[PDB]
Design a protein around this ligand. Structure first.
Ligand SMILES: OC[C@H]1O[C@H](OC[C@H]2O[C@@H](O[C@@H]3[C@@H](O[C@H]4[C@H](O)[C@@H](OC[C@H]5O[C@H](O)[C@@H](O)[C@@H]5O)O[C@@H]4CO[C@H]4O[C@H](CO)[C@@H](O)[C@@H]4O[C@@H]4O[C@H](CO)[C@@H](O)[C@@H]4O)O[C@H](CO)[C@H]3O)[C@@H](O)[C@@H]2O)[C@@H](O)[C@@H](O)[C@@H]1O
Lengths: 216, 212
């Protein structure tokens, strides 16, 4: 369980700034160069910045030169990215990753889960969660409506239920808010004896909702 | 800066076959070329480094080669779990990913299982009604959904959403959400969802009556 844990994302106005951090565990952080790689919505992976294990070589993609500053604190096992003068093209999920072992060899096989940076003037709003009630095989789900910004996570029965689950990509409504559904197919016979609860988490607004989905 | 050009952009391949992905560098990157698999919802996974060396635990059906500016990755004995976007990355002079190749697994035709959900009473308290139509586990991805309210064809008040290809059975699922005001919702009785797909003999309709 080598691990990289990014944090610090959120909503920031264009022209503003944010500081991302990445906490490493399970390895000698001081032995590895680190990189930031982002994925803007609807785009591919883009390498952003790298700092070598000893800080001797630092690089930036051209579009962030003079705006972003990468740094590391080996005593805290932490990597940082100070992002200034934020633009719309900076909206993305930001991964940290090891790249090289010292100046010896490229490795780049340890990645974090990403943290989301949203460059917007809009306000943070948490979702409402409504049930999609059931009627051989039955379908039921949760409707997660009117939140900002992306993303929302949905699980079922606290992660015990995974087979048959489909969580749809969010849809930007004309209001400017996002909405999505998560559904699951289950045996009809289990509808009264089994409990079904969807667990919606929207970290940007500290919204945690546990919704029971029962037949009407 | 070095430009990495991948081809083809998209690729649809049946299980058991092989596909070859191409990567071109605008100038020589020697052998510092890597390949990545990126499944939606997960972190990127390194497949190849040094143009032709498999990373730890990568099976022999991933084969990479190339030198200078021209590279290939060949993925043989393709499985449903291979549905992903594949990127090359040069690491000769800092790092640059290519624009990616999206690989879809071509499976047999599968018809949608259709379900309709009326608005919950809780949501009606807010003054909005969301009617959701679910199309489950179908292939291929192309599907048509028509909303009919009291036999009146709806237009402009619905939004669709399609899942990423399922990694185990290679199907898609689609949701269409009809959004109406509580007042408009309460003026009509029959709410219908009509589904057209290649795997269905004729279009399928699921409906409900408001209140039943
Ligand atoms: O068409 C122009 C040419 O562009 C490229 O060469 C440009 C010049 O860079 C050197 O040659 C390359 C050598 O570059 C390394 C250097 O060691 C180091 O120093 C560079 C700075 O000096 C220059 O003024 C600026 O270019 C730089 O700001 O940086 C580069 C890159 O180093 C990192 O990139 C890889 C990533 O895998 C890795 O070696 C280094 O990464 C960092 O280091 C640690 C590991 O040690 C990692 O944690 C961290 O990511 O490296 C190349 C050999 O592969 C040389 O190409 C001069 O020789 C060039 O004049 C190049 O494309 C060239 O072919 C073109 O002709």
């Amino acid at each position: 369980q080598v691990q990289l844990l990014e944090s610090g994302g959120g909503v920031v106005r264009p022209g503003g700034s944010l500081r991302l951090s990445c906490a490493a565990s399970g390895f000698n952080f001081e032995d590895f160069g680190m990189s930031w790689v982002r994925q803007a919505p609807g785009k591919g992976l883009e390498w952003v910045s790298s700092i070598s294990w000893n800080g001797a070589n630092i690089g930036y993609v051209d579009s962030v030169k003079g705006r972003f500053t990468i740094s590391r604190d080996n005593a805290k096992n932490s990597l940082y990215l100070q992002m200034n003068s934020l633009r719309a093209e900076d909206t993305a999920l930001y991964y940290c990753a090891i790249d090289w072992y010292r100046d010896d060899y490229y490795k780049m096989d340890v990645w974090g889960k990403g943290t989301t940076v949203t460059v917007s003037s809009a306000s943070t709003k948490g979702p409402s969660v409504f049930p999609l009630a059931p009627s051989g095989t039955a379908a039921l789900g949760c409707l997660v409506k009117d939140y900002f910004p992306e993303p929302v996570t949905v699980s079922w029965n606290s992660g015990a239920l995974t087979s048959g689950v489909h969580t749809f990509p969010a849809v930007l409504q004309s209001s400017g808010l996002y909405s999505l559904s998560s559904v699951v197919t289950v045996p009809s016979s289990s509808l009264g004896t089994q409990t079904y609860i969807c667990n919606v988490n929207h970290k940007p607004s500290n919204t945690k909702v546990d919704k029971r989905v029962e037949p009407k | 800066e070095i430009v990495m050009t991948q081809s083809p952009a998209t690729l649809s391949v049946s299980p058991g076959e092989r596909a070859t992905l191409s990567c071109r560098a605008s100038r020589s990157i020697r052998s510092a070329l890597a390949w990545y698999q990126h499944k939606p919802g997960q972190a990127p996974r390194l497949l190849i480094f040094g143009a032709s060396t498999r990373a730890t635990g990568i099976p022999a059906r991933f084969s990479g080669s190339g030198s200078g500016t021209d590279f290939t990755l060949t993925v043989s004995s393709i499985r449903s779990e291979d549905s992903a976007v594949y990127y090359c990355q040069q690491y000769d002079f800092w790092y640059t990913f290519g624009q990616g190749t999206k690989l879809e697994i071509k499976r047999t035709v599968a018809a949608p299982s259709v379900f309709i959900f009326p608005p919950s009473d809780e949501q009606l308290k807010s003054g909005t009604a969301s009617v959701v139509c679910l199309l489950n586990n179908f292939y291929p991805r192309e599907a048509k959904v028509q909303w009919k309210v009291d036999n009146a064809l709806q237009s402009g008040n619905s939004q669709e959403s399609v899942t990423e290809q399922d990694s185990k059975d290679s199907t898609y699922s689609l949701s269409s959400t009809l959004t109406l005001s509580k007042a408009d919702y309460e003026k009509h009785k029959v709410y219908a969802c009509e589904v057209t797909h290649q795997g269905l003999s004729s279009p399928v309709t699921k409906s409900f009556n408001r209140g039943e």
